[PDB]
Amino acid sequence: DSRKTYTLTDYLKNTYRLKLYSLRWISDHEYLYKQENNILVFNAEYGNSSVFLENSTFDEFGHSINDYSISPDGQFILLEYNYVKQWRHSYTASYDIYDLNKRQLITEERIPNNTQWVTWSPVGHKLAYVWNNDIYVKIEPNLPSYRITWTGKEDIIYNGITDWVYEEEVFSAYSALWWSPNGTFLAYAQFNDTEVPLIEYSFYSDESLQYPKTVRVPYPKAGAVNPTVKFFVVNTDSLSSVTNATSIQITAPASMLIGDHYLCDVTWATQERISLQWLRRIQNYSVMDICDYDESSGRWNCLVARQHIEMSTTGWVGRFRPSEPHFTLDGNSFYKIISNEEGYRHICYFQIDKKDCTFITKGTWEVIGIEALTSDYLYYISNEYKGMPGGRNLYKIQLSDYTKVTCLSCELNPERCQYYSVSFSKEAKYYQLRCSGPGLPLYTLHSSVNDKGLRVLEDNSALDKMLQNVQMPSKKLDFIILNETKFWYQMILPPHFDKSKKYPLLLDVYAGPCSQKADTVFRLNWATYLASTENIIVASFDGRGSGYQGDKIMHAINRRLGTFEVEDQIEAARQFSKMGFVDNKRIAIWGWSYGGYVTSMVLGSGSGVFKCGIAVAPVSRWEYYDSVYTERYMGLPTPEDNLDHYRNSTVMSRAENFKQVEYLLIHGTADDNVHFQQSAQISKALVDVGVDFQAMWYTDEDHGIASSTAHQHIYTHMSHFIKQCFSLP
Template sequence: MSDFARDEETDAAEFRLQLSKPHEHRRRSFLVTACLSLSTVLFSAYLFISIISSLKGSGTLNNGSGPRLPNKQIDYTKDGLLKVSFANVRNRTFQPEVKPLQWISTPDSHKNDKGLYVTFENDTYSVRSVLDESYSKTLFEGTSFTYDSKNYTVDAVVASPELSKVLIRSETEKGWRHSTFGTYFVYENDSFHKIDSEISIAKWSPNSRDIVYVKGNDIYLYSSDSHETSKRITNDGSELVFNGKPDWVYEEEVLEGDTALWWSPTGDYLAFFKINETSVEEFPIPYFVQENQTNSAYPELRKIKYPKSGSSNPINKLNIYDLSADKVSQIDSTSDDSLITEVTWVGNHEIIAKVSDRSSDILTVIMVDAADGSRSEVSRIEESDGGWWEITHKTTFVPKDKSRSRSYNGYIDLVPVDGYNHLVYFTTNVTTEIPSVVLTSGEWEVVDGPAAFDEEFNNVYFIATKKSSTERHLYYVNLERPQKVYAVTDERLNGYYSASFSAGARFLLLNYLGPDVPYQKIIDLKSDTKDKNIRGNIIGKTLYYLEKNEKLHNSLKRYAIPARIFRELTLGKDQNGSDIIVNSYEILPNDFDPSLKNHYPVFFFAYGGPNSQQVAQTFGIGFNQVIASQLDAIVVVVDGRGTGFKGKEFRSIVRGNLGDVESTDQILAAKLYGQNSYVNKEKISLFGWSYGGYLTLKTLEKDAGKHFKYGVSVAPVTDWLLYDSVYTERYMHTPQKNPEGYDKCKVHNATAFATVPRFLLMHGTADDNVHFQNSLKYLDLLNLNNIENYDVHVFPDSDHSIQYHNANVIVFNKILNWIRHAYNGDFLL
């Protein structure tokens, strides 16, 4: 789920260095994929880690209220170690090395798993094997090529499933958050064959001959045998009708990707979305400083179809194309107002589609038989019972195999069991005596869904919070022994892991992400021998380390890194008299001295969106450590009620009333910290971006300066009527059904801000996600109420990530220097 701008590539959840910039039109990509079942691991959790910009200290006036922060950066601690600064964060001093390894699936890899993967070394794309080090198959050599006397740069390479041909993308242009457009070629036997330009999606068929592609929102079929487009599957694609490609809201909030089409396992059928956004209202976004504007005297106006809360959503219908019959069938078992959130093939001609109402109260699972045209039936209907249905993308097909006690095709889904997300095995034959089996249960949660299924041994691998909600360990459960969970990683030590499996689930890429320095290793789960020295995995044999990060280990010896201390906080009692227990961590400044009185400022960072998490035991040295080191401040992060991985009751309390208990929990935490004798209660601040920006404003509004004296809000929602329907209504219902909730949840009490000493608001004018309109409406509210105790910084043409024209450097410099002024008392003069 995108969790409304929670995307770890662009939001400032942990303030990392933006390594790829959304406004760059040509983006080098070494992501090489093959077949639909490809597992791509880029250590995505490292997008938590690093950050932003450079810093130079600024001089300030001293009003005499407490210790004065230094005018310039202090580089060393008392024991002579280097402090964390913007400069060494920015130059990647603390950035772990990440080795991408991309498993590939070939037609026989589920039965004969050699651990094949694609790599890019010495300007060569090749297939290697973790089982056989001598195996190597070259896919393509070079980073550019010439076609029709024109030079093209290789931006992405996708191998066909049988590895004899390669699909190459060039001339890549950025779309929205996930989407791109480009020119595609097929490379085979040292020859290039151009498919077309301005293609948004191109996917190999499992038959390794056909390629489906989308251009102009229509779907075409290209034959790599005849080197020509053989079929035009749709004819109604337009600016309003999207075939096989998501519109803005489906890309951002539902699919969280650029693709809305899915090949069947044998390539006989193609499922795709037909999204009609005719009834969706347009939102205009002006661009003022674009370098390629033809007339710089006038802004360029771009319009997007953006459904806001309570307004018309796009109409989405699932379609099936039968290649042999050359026929498209539309599945009509969904209403125009419903959301189709996930599509999974569960056989050669069977498909399931998850459908919810627009407020995500009821989940309906529809079974479709592609061999029988548009015939479909409802196999499951489940209500949310006071919560909501989060969108999933990891429903996993389990093929029938009677020799292994699987009499029917089935699938494994993520389903609430007694208030916690767990794995349930369903058969596609709903008439069976036992159509479903609960595989896991308990007061812990499976994260996202199944990670892999081993067809030979019936083992289902998954990442879960079984040990702690702030950790991630790898486990497995067997279909024939439900509820008996086995740990793959060592639970004796704190750990946060991610995992990627080869096509047959024999080989594992285990990524240790924290809390210590990360490493990556390849493991043979079916080896007859085990590791003598346990590190990470307690099952399987380590074949080799992909990355140990020894260089980073050595570099850290020179630095005094302020440590994160994880704990549970008891904030008080809720309205039912139960303890409010939340996850948190604090970062104490270098040379911390608890004997000092009324000394340390406290810098709270918050995100706090529904089902999100910031208190996670990953490795990361970034903006929070800079704050602690350079401003001598205690940094505190609190995952209050409404956040994820602590069960349905904990997160669903925010349903219909966003911003209420979340802000209460931040205030209770500030009150708790203010009781420490070494804390200066007049120097407690709160900073947040996106939902965190909203939470910052709601907290300042509710607190009215009693505990939080300063706040920094970046790109906030200020009124949920202004945000997109899919995200907002999942947590708030529609404004037509919940008008009082929407009225209460917006930032509305301007006079409460008058008693806050100072706050800062920042936003990008070209934010397609959280529109600049939010901040403008809020500023108008302040004007109407004669509120002047704030500062504003606007970033021309920056989107939600605030990066255009050096903006990402400025935004974090601004935050740090502004907070420095606040802690020095300059705003009280």
């Protein structure tokens, strides 16, 4: 075999690029696709298309357009530029509205610069945006905006947008506004961070900045003061009729008001019915209110007879939060993924005014998500196929006969495709399937009326050809039995894997709650190069605490992070040793964030199993991480609750054991998520016990250390360290 191998430069330069097929449904019949810098519109049924927007339309715009957004009625397009990223989802940008019909740009009553969020109404072309922490609404793109709130205050009062912790841990979005189905009402959340402590750190910026800037962010660490929240609904149809439309507040249940709580879900059911889910700071109790508009009082009332409670005795509620409801068209019933009596998450059917739901699916597997719902069918993704927790397939279940369940993707290409994600058209008339492994990604279009494949959108044939001239590694996905329980793992094996030989092994770990590192997804990453070029076996293992396998496994680390998930990774290392093809003298471990925490906990366990390890932006002490995430699994860091385990699960307390291993600690100085503070304390602890180790800080990089140059630099640095640790005499 004289073929080249997949090198580090290949990975860092992205020589072998996976092609994608990102489309945007604009209706139940067509979608927009960007090709040749121009926006094309495709007819799903026949595959024919037209030039929706010539790539030359805005050559003299004067700005590089970051993204586009077509109004629901296709009459206008929102141009986004001057994009400036903030956290994981938040960012600010400038916007110009283009009239597609008059093929002219709107220059009157423009959306202001430094806008925090903007979104079209579900129908028509109304606009709601947040600027300087206040909400504004534009009925017509060229007309003056109506101000909705006057409380907005930087880092203090957030209207229509989330604060740091709500963005990252609760809504996974910066937006905190929800239009009603036909756009009449605009609902929104308001966060008050007045007493939330601030994390502060330096930002050096370009060399030209003489004095470092101090970034300050309202961020509640474990047990600190959380932001408070309020919910409001305003009738946008009355804006042009009244000088100041009233925002009607919907107060949280008394069961929530008794203490700290969170607004965790907002979902409209009908034009005049909205559901809200609240969660107690002690995340094992959630309440869902279903509220109707009272046309006579202009108020929103939530009948207790329509209030649903969801709690957990073994852990927290939901995988990462209470699941969202999926309402029937009439809004009188909904479907929700919840853990059944066996601890497996399945779809339960609810009548809004009946507290007991009916499970429509069941078994020793789990529903991953509900993708679409029609009057006759509900489509969902699950890992039922072949009992593989790391596989994903699309299923269709007949609402009039639950025994009728069809897997729409399982047999499309069983050898190449075992992991799917889907994208349905507006009314689920068509759906695009996205296969992401174990083979190369395959994109296909299908018609729901007969479930027939319409055509292949992208099969990555080009890339496949290229990879032929390369000695690519292989992936082994299997399981090992521990205490009569099955635990999955995967190994990226180097080319020509020979079981009679001894290969050095690198344990790629994450292991956070409900995590999954053993799956059927195909990836071109650092591990690819390590296996391919350095002949290193890169393994990952899903032990206790991992998700998609039922609550018995997932809740195993409840109130006890830093234990079972850590111990199991070590045991997994021993197990792989027993397999016979591993050089026990060369076993390393590495991880990012939670993975860095587990890596450090393992390296400081004194097991003697690992020779070296690399921790990137690791958590080191739970009281340093945020409240929402941490408390969900750890409760409160108080004597009366769980302070003892909080203080017993730190990386610092194991400092002395690092004398037995080679350690590389890496962290970006501008990490707003896992603060540099966390690694700063690890290093100080190691220095205090006289432990030598390697370190690397990345100036102004955040938790992702993803800038082009930093990305190349960190993996290069880590490669040298791994090669050095495995180098033989």
